[PDB]
């Protein structure tokens, strides 16, 4: 059994292509990393040493309210509003977003379903002004990731969990984009108010594609020799440029709607 | 399915005996409460509604360093020191202590192995000046729970988990208290320092008694008609006064050492 250390994981990260000042959104399957001396906090600590105090690490937090509780009117009274300071991350995204969110100094954005946890030099910029309606468009941490030419790291995670590609769905012009409208409780200056949202669908694909077609795009982007693979600990990992994968994915999407 | 709510949980705790101004050390098996609307945070939220802002809810945090790693001289330099604001709770204690530790406004004491997470009106008093050596004695959140006549809620948790009683062992005079001595890294204003610790054993019972011997004590304590049993959500729960079970566990231990 190979043990990882904050020093060891730092080197694996520089090996994958991570440098000073980088902003990186990390999706992670942490137990694929193997044994770590000081726990998965060594991952975040190693990252921050590599990228420096001006860099920023992000995690997709979201939140925990199931759709049927939300859509069931007996439950409505007892559902706490979304609190970017106390609402815990959705557990389907793994411990990684909660690891970030619960580290002191971290910040979290306002759009509940698209909410992002961030820590580092630009965590305030990344979490600020998160558009509530259409939280995966230009006024979101994902959009600012592209503007800052950040990166996406799949830390042993399945490739179809690349949330950044939902931003490509928003930008990409193709016909019959499913529009989603739901109502969720948030706080308005301290008090629970129920509110109507609208966004492009992120729970299921455009009609033709499969539930995991994100993975095909990522593998097809890695096929052009952009990006870079490598081992972080013992987890197979991928590091992609945010702007390039998003430009790649929107054409791929716009190319597919022109068809049939 | 009976779903519990912040209002529903508030009742069940009022029925068990929680009141305004109470300090309560909570040990939990959150899975046995069943389905809750807003998750387990409704439990804490309902608690502080019942005790009010002057009350305090506590949890046994500890921390995650494995002994076998601590004493490996090759692992020595990659082990992060204990940071009371960053070190995550031990996972053997369930989600409850880190539920509290990661709630905004909560606090955590300095004694690593005996660390406690606290939130409420007197969380700063309970967490302050936790003795590094013998962190289960009078200079600990456990001792101040007795001084403030607090309570212990066993929220579906097995009975042997009442860490408050490891503090009775510290107080109780009896033969052959196995003393433990180890070296652990601790953060000293932001810099890792290794340091030798000293305490009465808490991971193993005094050799005569069973590992699970805390359960029998509380059962025995229950049978004197003090403390109260009741249902929190769907979890069978017990709420006892801190000072009474401590004083009752000391007589009990000193009695057994006379033999
Ligand atoms: C209201 N919210 C929702 C809406 O926003 C909307 O949601 C969608 C969502 O439905 C979409 O999801 C759809 O599309 C996709 C396509 N992929 C799939 C799901 C669909 N429903 C979503 N698209 S994206 C999903 C983004 N996901 C991620 O980023 C997560 C990536 N990671 C993984 O996938 C891994 O494979 C997981 C599943 C996490 C497995 O991880 P793992 O098993 O390897 O282990 P962990 O990572 O969790 O950690 C294990 C390890 O960690 C350490 N650890 C835990 N706790 C510790 C403590 N306390 N202390 C120390 N260490 C700790 C341990 O070592 C542990 O190991 P051990 O326990 O010892 O074994 C887009 C969204 N918009 O619509 C739905 C909703 C609900 O409305
Ligand atoms: C340096 N450290 C150590 C030393 O200090 C020293 O340690 C000793 C220690 O060894 C002693 O332990 C020994 O003596 C005893 C005495 N019986 C037993 C163990 C011995 N090794 C210790 N004596 S005290 C132990 C104190 N224990 C507790 O306080 C914990 C009580 N709880 C329980 O017992 C439950 O039964 C557990 C075990 C927690 C299981 O409960 P559960 O599985 O049913 O449910 P959970 O509570 O975990 O919650 C899960 C549930 O909650 C919701 N949830 C979780 N996460 C959520 C998130 N992120 N979001 C929303 N909701 C969440 C979910 O519903 C979840 O359920 P689900 O996942 O959906 O299924 C004294 C010490 N000093 O020596 C050793 C060391 C290491 O040196
Ligand atoms: Cl450091
Ligand atoms: Cl209403
Ligand atoms: Cl992969």
Binding-site residues of B for acetyl-CoA: 27-28, 30-31, 64, 91, 95, 163
* CA–CA separation, B251 and B192 (whole Å): 41
Binding-site residues of A for CoA: 27-28, 30-31, 64, 91, 95
- Rounded to 10 deg, the angle between the B41-51 and B6-16 helix axes is 50
Can you spell out the DSSP letters for B168-207?
HHHHS--S---EEEEEEEEESSSSEEEEEEEEE-SSS--T
Three-state SS string over A134-147 comes to CCCCCCCHHHHHHH
Do residues B58 and B186 make contact, with C-beta atoms less than 8 angstroms apart? Answer: no
Q: Which of these, B236, B246, B235, B239, lies nearest to B222 by C-alpha position?
A: B239
Q: Which of these, A49, A175, A190, A61, lies nearest to A116 by C-alpha position?
A: A61
According to DSSP, the β-strands at A23-28 and A151-155 are parallel
* CA–CA separation, A6 and A39 (whole Å): 10
Do residues A56 and A118 make contact, with C-beta atoms less than 8 angstroms apart? Answer: yes
* CA–CA separation, B153 and B60 (whole Å): 12
DSSP state letter for B226: -
- Joined together, the tokens standing for residue A120 give 């580092």
Question: Among the atoms of ligand 1, which is closest to the Cα of residue A27?
Answer: 29
Count of residues for chain A?
260
Q: Is B100 helix (H, G, I), strand (E, B) or coil?
A: helix
Q: Which residue do the tokens 């716009």 mark?
A: A254
* CA–CA separation, B11 and B15 (whole Å): 6
Helix-strand-coil percent breakdown of chain B, rounded to 5? 35, 20, 45
* CA–CA separation, A57 and A157 (whole Å): 16
**Strands ordered across the beta sheet of B116-120:** B107-108, B116-120, B56-60, B23-28, B151-155, B235-241, B228-232
Between the alpha carbon of residue A255 and those of residues A160, A161, A173, A206, the distances in Å are: 20, 22, 9, 14
Q: What is the dihedral of CA B76, B78, B82, B83, to 10 degrees?
A: 160
According to DSSP, the β-strands at B228-232 and A235-241 are unpaired
Please enumerate in sequence order all residues whose Cβ is within 8 A of that of B102, keeping only pairs 6 or more positions apart, or say none: A102
Q: How many helices (H) does chain A have, and how many strands (E)?
A: 9, 11
* CA–CA separation, A42 and A48 (whole Å): 10
Neighbours of B242 (CB within 10 A): 24
Strand partners, A196: A183
Please enumerate in sequence order all residues whose Cβ is within 8 A of that of B196, keeping only pairs 6 or more positions apart, or say none: B181, B182, B183
For B165-186, letters b (16+ CB in 10 Å) and e give bbbbbbbbebeeeeeeeeebbb
Do residues A154 and A162 make contact, with C-beta atoms less than 8 angstroms apart? Answer: yes
According to DSSP, the β-strands at A151-155 and A179-188 are unpaired
Partner-chain contact B37 A79, CB within 8 Å: yes
The torsion angles phi and psi of A3, rounded to 5 degrees, stand at -95, 145
Q: Residue A113 burial (CB < 10 Å; 0-12/13-18/19+)?
A: buried
- Rounded to 10 deg, the angle between the A6-16 and A41-51 helix axes is 50
CA B247 to chain centre: 17
Q: Which residue do the tokens 């949890």 mark?
A: B59
Strand partners, A117: A59, A108
Neighbours of A55 (CB within 10 A): 22
Do residues B112 and B87 make contact, with C-beta atoms less than 8 angstroms apart? Answer: yes
Do residues B185 and B83 make contact, with C-beta atoms less than 8 angstroms apart? Answer: no
* CA–CA separation, A77 and B4 (whole Å): 12
Q: How many helices (H) does chain B have, and how many strands (E)?
A: 9, 9
- Joined together, the tokens standing for residue A94 give 């793994």
* CA–CA separation, A21 and A73 (whole Å): 47
C-alpha A238 to ligand 1 mean position (Å): 17
Can you spell out the DSSP letters for A112-133?
TTT-EEEEETTHHHHHTT--ST
Do residues A250 and A236 make contact, with C-beta atoms less than 8 angstroms apart? Answer: no
Partners of B39 on chain A (C-beta within 8 Å) are: 64, 88
Angle at B155 between CA B150 and CA B158, to 5 degrees: 105
Do residues A4 and A35 make contact, with C-beta atoms less than 8 angstroms apart? Answer: yes
Alpha carbons within 13 angstroms on the beta-carbon side of residue B13 total 31
Neighbours of A156 (CB within 10 A): 22
Do residues A237 and A24 make contact, with C-beta atoms less than 8 angstroms apart? Answer: no
* CA–CA separation, B124 and B145 (whole Å): 13
Do residues B197 and B133 make contact, with C-beta atoms less than 8 angstroms apart? Answer: yes
Best residue among B62, B80, B88, B100 to mutate for probing ligand 1's pocket (most ligand atoms within 8 Å of CB) is B88
A·B CB contacts under 8 A: 51
* CA–CA separation, A255 and B2 (whole Å): 51
Pocket of ligand 1 from Cβ distances under 6 Å = A 27-32, 39-40, 60, 62-63, 65, 67, 90, 93-96, 113, 157-158, 160-161, 163, 202-203; B 88, 91, 98
Between the alpha carbon of residue B246 and those of residues A39, B63, B77, the distances in Å are: 35, 25, 40
Q: Which of these, A72, A83, A92, A76, lies nearest to A112 by C-alpha position?
A: A83
Q: Which residue do the tokens 């200079």 mark?
A: B139
Neighbours of B29 (CB within 10 A): 18
Count of residues for chain B?
259
* CA–CA separation, A26 and A142 (whole Å): 12
Nearest chain A alpha carbon to B39: A64
């Amino acid at each position: 059994s190979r043990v990882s250390t904050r020093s060891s994981l730092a080197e694996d990260l520089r090996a994958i292509g991570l440098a000073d000042g980088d902003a990186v959104l990390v999706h992670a399957a942490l137990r694929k990393v193997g044994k770590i001396v000081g726990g998965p906090d060594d991952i975040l600590d190693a990252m921050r040493d590599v990228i420096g105090p001006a860099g920023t690490v992000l995690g997709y937090a979201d939140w925990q309210l199931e759709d049927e509780i939300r859509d069931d009117p007996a439950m409505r009274e007892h559902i706490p509003a979304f609190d970017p300071l106390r609402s815990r991350s959705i557990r389907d995204n793994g411990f990684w977003p909660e690891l970030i969110r619960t580290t002191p100094g971290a910040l979290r954005s306002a759009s509940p379903g698209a909410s992002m946890a961030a820590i580092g030099g630009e965590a305030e910029w990344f979490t600020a002004d998160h558009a509530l309606d259409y939280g995966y468009g230009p006024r979101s941490p994902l959009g600012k990731l592209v503007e800052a030419k950040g990166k996406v790291l799949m830390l042993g995670a399945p490739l179809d969990t690349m949330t950044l590609l939902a931003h490509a769905e928003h930008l990409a012009d193709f016909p019959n984009k499913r529009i989603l409208r739901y109502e969720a409780p948030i706080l308005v200056d301290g008090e629970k108010v129920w509110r109507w949202f609208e966004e492009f669908d992120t729970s299921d694909p455009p009609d033709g594609l499969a539930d995991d077609y994100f993975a095909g795009i990522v593998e097809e982007f890695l096929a052009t020799g952009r990006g870079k693979r490598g081992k972080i600990g013992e987890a197979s990992s991928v590091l992609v440029p945010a702007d390039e994968i998003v430009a790649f994915a929107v054409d791929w999407l716009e190319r597919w709607g022109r068809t049939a």
